């Protein structure tokens, strides 16, 4: 074992658990008791005041629940223990692969136990309906899944197992995150899927255990209407949109356009025509003067388009965005759409810059806290803050 | 013979120590009499004089005769934190045989940490020491509950059929077995309880956690307080707890001021003054608290069916049931922001609250019977900017109903007198004026008091809306006014906003658009010179 530490003057997380559904608790009891039967967790009394929430989910179509522990507070508190071990360099080639397959490797941590003095911090309670029984509180004896240090301890151990693989097929890029293994290969999908099987066999041989396509990923530009005969309202709306665009693309001039009924058309003036066309060309080009500063976290802002479509902006500072894209799925449920959208944003973010950004969700916090776990299939959990202001950005983007 | 749960202090603390304000001999005799028998019971031991701490003891009649009490107010400030909802009557399944057993002061049966006993001395102005849980330590309930769980686990294991609850001193045991059988099984339970040193002292009604259990119904024993011109302070520290507990049973209880008046105060010699305002609030709260609740036992084989009704202006109902005319639980909901809202959004928030409460109580989300028409809900959910969901539900027809009063058009209207508005405000003397500019040029600038920028932006729209016909177009340079208006609200603290709402109700085709500020767009230039 190796020591585990906290940022000085930081206490263990004390975050109360939100209520759970009857089937969820019924299955969670089975999972947790089976775990204790195999020595994975040990029950505790009231001397441990810490607690982190739990919720059992279903990752895939397989009919078997699996539990998640929101270690957002524990990861934040134990952020210092990451600085002792940095994964340098992060693979920049995954961004270019033709196929990246995500293989769950959470089960690896079950064999490497934790440093004892930190066991107390990983505690959770599986609450009972109507608060009849007080609630069985356990502690993690083996390493957690979502804990920041969970792969940090296993990094050296695992990379030993990967040594043959990186030895014999360099073009594969294998990169890991809190629970997941991303394997990339810019090959034909036929043999990409072939080496996926061999990697699975290699992993299980030494005791461990939609498709994702970065190349097809594209940056959606912003377009401007060009109706054959616009009317006075159209120019007003177009100007109102464009003057916002200067905060992104500085090379924008509209002084001709604003040169000025709204039942009729107003034919555009020629100098306005040329200037506007020049601006249209400028807008339809790759964003400029933007890069990544790894010293600051990343912000993901989602805005709803209200017809079974969504748009998002991924930025590190305001008015300067790294990745822009839309999420669409054609009358269905609504919370499911954000949850799928949040998951797809975070998968892309993990691939491209290797960390989950902070979300600014378009939903009341009360609403999210009830039905976010119903439709989440992912081991990780991103930090989110809630937005209660409708801007013009939603109309601006699409 | 029962394992002691380890307990430690909060870090960087070496208390407690408070000089007990010396008592008098008549009561001291009572303290001695209690102490001798308490010791011979192996409960409290006369420590060695090397222990340096002390805490006060008072004598209470236990009625409104010199019952022992030790004030652990300063002791609680150093204890390590421990894990600390309430079981609602609505969540008790039917059980044809029911009994409620009370533990005979079981806190005097679960040992306290022998290593922590140094911090709970007991002087009679003869230092003593607790070895079992204190009778008033806020840390005691947690360890008591834990010990009860650990001792009950085997008996529960060997009997899966029975269901056993325990909150403070009651052991709600229920089973479907016959009474002739159930008494024998409960006798087994009592003997097993005695095995671990617990003592059990020694009927259509049953009093369980303050809920009166009945053959097919449940109710709350009416909860009332002692009344006096001035109340004993320590009892006030009790009555706050009783009111707190009643808050879960019956809403509309706030004692925050009463709690502050206690918390600031730390003495008993002076007769503690009580405010008239908070006292009257307590009295009026109690008057409302005179209401007998009801309900019936939940049967999981039948689905919950809730229903919300719109009383008026931010008052709703929370009727929950599984059969007609048998309320499982009834509640009411009111506005939370109190500033800007709309009825459909209020309905969504009410559904959210009901779902949260239902998952808490029974665990399965219900089938709401909302009143709103489906077309209206679909339109609002497809057009509103944020994300909202309602679980499976059906409309129910009632004379009052919820609808969006008005809509803001999505296409500027042919012939409609497009009306331009603008607004600005100053700071030294609130010298900002408002008005509107129109296609034909009609306008009016009427001086305004308490001129505020957001206020002015609002005022610009209303000035034009008052002198506008049916079909209107309004171009505003405020994103804020547009945002407030286009949220389709129905209640706001502003009679200005409400006046706009009542005005816009009359209009038939109203269309709003926005412009950038401090730019020449061929409109407001007529009164661009308004302020500068």
From Swiss-Prot, chain A:
Effect upon mutating residue 46 to G: 74% loss of polymerase activity. 86% loss of RNase H activity
Effect seen on changing residue 180 to E: Drastically reduced incorporation of phosphorothioate nucleotide. Loss of pyrophosphorolysis (reverse of the polymerase reaction). No effect on RNase H activity
Positions of Mg(2+) 1 binding: 104, 179-180
Impact noted for substituting residue 371 to L: Almost complete loss of RT p66/p51 heterodimerization. Complete loss of polymerase activity
Documented effect of changing residue 147 to A: 73% loss of DNA-directed DNA polymerase activity. 70% loss of RNA-directed DNA polymerase activity
Result when mutating residue 178 to I: 54% loss of polymerase activity according to PubMed:9533880; increases polymerase activity according to PubMed:9657675. No loss of RNase H activity
Record note on what altering residue 59 to A does: Strong decrease in RT binding affinity for all dNTP substrates and in catalytic efficiency. 100-fold decreased sensitivity to ddNTP inhibitors
Stated consequence of mutating residue 177 to F: 70% loss of polymerase activity. No loss of polymerase activity
Site positions for Essential for RT p66/p51 heterodimerization: 371, 384
Superkingdom classification of source: Viruses
Domain Reverse transcriptase: residue ranges: 38-212
Effect in UniProt of substituting residue 161 to D: 16% loss of DNA-directed DNA polymerase activity. 24% loss of RNA-directed DNA polymerase activity
Result, substituting residue 161 to V: 70% loss of DNA-directed DNA polymerase activity. 64% loss of RNA-directed DNA polymerase activity
The protein's name in its UniProt record: p51 RT
Organism of origin: Human immunodeficiency virus type 1 group M subtype B (isolate BH10) (HIV-1)
Span of the entire protein shown here: 606 to 1027 of 1447
Swiss-Prot record, chain B:
Effect of residue 420 to A: Virions contain primarily p51 RT
Stated consequence of mutating residue 212 to A: Complete loss of RNA-dependent DNA polymerase activity. Complete loss of RNA 5'-end and 3'-end cleavages
Motif Tryptophan repeat motif in this chain: 377-393
Annotated effect of mutating residue 173 to M: 27% increase of DNA-directed DNA polymerase activity. 10% loss of RNA-directed DNA polymerase activity
Annotated effect of mutating residue 430 to R: In strain: Isolate PV22
Catalytically driven reaction(s): Endohydrolysis of RNA in RNA/DNA hybrids. Three different cleavage modes: 1. sequence-specific internal cleavage of RNA. Human immunodeficiency virus type 1 and Moloney murine leukemia virus enzymes prefer to cleave the RNA strand one nucleotide away from the RNA-DNA junction. 2. RNA 5'-end directed cleavage 13-19 nucleotides from the RNA end. 3. DNA 3'-end directed cleavage 15-20 nucleotides away from the primer terminus; DNA(n) + a 2'-deoxyribonucleoside 5'-triphosphate = DNA(n+1) + diphosphate
Effect of residue 419 to L: No effect on cleavage between p51 RT and p15
Places the protein is found: Virion
Annotated effect of mutating residue 170 to A: Strongly decreased RNA-directed and DNA-directed DNA polymerase activities. Loss of pyrophosphorolysis (reverse of the polymerase reaction). No effect on RNase H activity
Effect of residue 480 to R: Almost no effect on RNAase H activity. Unable to replicate. Completely resistant to inhibition by BBNH
Residues that, per the record, bind Mg(2+) 2: 422, 457, 477, 528
Result when mutating residue 480 to W: Almost no effect on RNAase H activity and replication. 6-fold resistance to inhibition by BBNH
Effect ascribed to mutating residue 209 to A: No effect on RNA-dependent DNA polymerase activity. No effect on RNA 5'-end and 3'-end cleavages
Effect upon mutating residue 457 to Q: No loss of polymerase activity. complete loss of RNase H activity
Protein residues bound to Mg(2+) 1: 102, 169-170
Effect noted on mutating residue 102 to S: 5- to 12-fold decrease in affinity for dTTP substrates. Strongly decreased RNA-directed DNA polymerase activity. Slightly decreased DNA-directed DNA polymerase activity. No effect on RNase H activity
Note in the entry: Error-prone enzyme that lacks a proof-reading function. High mutations rate is a direct consequence of this characteristic. RT also displays frequent template switching leading to high recombination rate. Recombination mostly occurs between homologous regions of the two copackaged RNA genomes. If these two RNA molecules derive from different viral strains, reverse transcription will give rise to highly recombinated proviral DNAs.
Domain notes for this protein: RT is structured in five subdomains: finger, palm, thumb, connection and RNase H. Within the palm subdomain, the 'primer grip' region is thought to be involved in the positioning of the primer terminus for accommodating the incoming nucleotide. The RNase H domain stabilizes the association of RT with primer-template. The tryptophan repeat motif is involved in RT p66/p51 dimerization.
Name under which the protein is recorded: Reverse transcriptase/ribonuclease H
Gene from which the chain derives: gag-pol
Complete-protein stretch covered: 603 to 1152 of 1447
């Amino acid at each position: 074992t190796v020591p585990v530490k906290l940022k000085p003057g930081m206490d263990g997380p004390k975050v109360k658990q939100w209520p759970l559904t009857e089937e969820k608790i019924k299955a969670l009891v089975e999972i947790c008791t089976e775990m204790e039967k195999e020595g994975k967790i040990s029950k505790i009394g009231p001397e441990n005041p810490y607690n982190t929430p739990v919720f059992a989910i279903k990752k895939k179509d397989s009919t078997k629940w699996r539990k998640l522990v929101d270690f957002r507070e524990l990861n934040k508190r134990t952020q210092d223990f990451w600085e002792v071990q940095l994964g340098i360099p992060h693979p920049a080639g995954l961004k270019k692969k033709k196929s990246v397959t995500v293989l769950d490797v959470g089960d690896a941590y079950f064999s490497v136990p934790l440093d004892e003095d930190f066991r107390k911090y990983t505690a959770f309670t599986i609450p009972s309906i109507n608060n009849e029984t007080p609630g069985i509180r356990y502690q993690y004896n083996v390493l957690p899944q979502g804990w920041k240090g969970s792969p940090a301890i296993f990094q050296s151990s695992m990379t030993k197992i990967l040594e043959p693989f990186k030895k014999q097929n360099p073009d594969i890029v294998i990169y890991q995150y809190m629970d997941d293994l991303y394997v990339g290969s810019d090959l034909e999908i036929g043999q990409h899927r072939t080496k996926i099987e061999e990697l699975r066999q290699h992993l299980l041989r030494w005791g461990l255990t939609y498709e994702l396509h970065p190349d097809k990923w594209t940056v959606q530009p912003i377009v401007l209407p060009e109706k054959d005969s616009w009317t006075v309202n159209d120019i007003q709306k177009l100007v109102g949109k464009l003057n916002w665009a200067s905060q992104i693309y500085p090379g924008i001039k509209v002084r001709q356009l604003c040169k000025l009924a709204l039942t009729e058309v107003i034919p555009l003036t020629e100098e306005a025509e040329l200037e506007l066309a020049e601006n249209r060309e400028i807008l339809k080009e790759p964003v400029h003067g933007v890069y990544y500063d790894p010293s600051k976290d990343l912000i993901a802002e989602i805005q709803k388009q209200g017809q079974g479509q969504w748009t998002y902006q991924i930025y590190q500072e305001p008015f300067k965005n790294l990745k822009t894209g839309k999420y669409a799925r054609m009358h269905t449920n609504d919370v499911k759409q954000l949850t799928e959208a949040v998951q797809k944003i975070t998968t892309e973010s993990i691939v491209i810059w290797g960390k989950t950004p902070k979300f600014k969700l378009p939903i009341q916090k009360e609403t999210w806290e009830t039905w976010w776990t119903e439709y989440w299939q992912a081991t990780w959990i991103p930090e989110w803050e809630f937005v209660n202001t409708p801007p013009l950005v939603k109309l601006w983007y699409q």
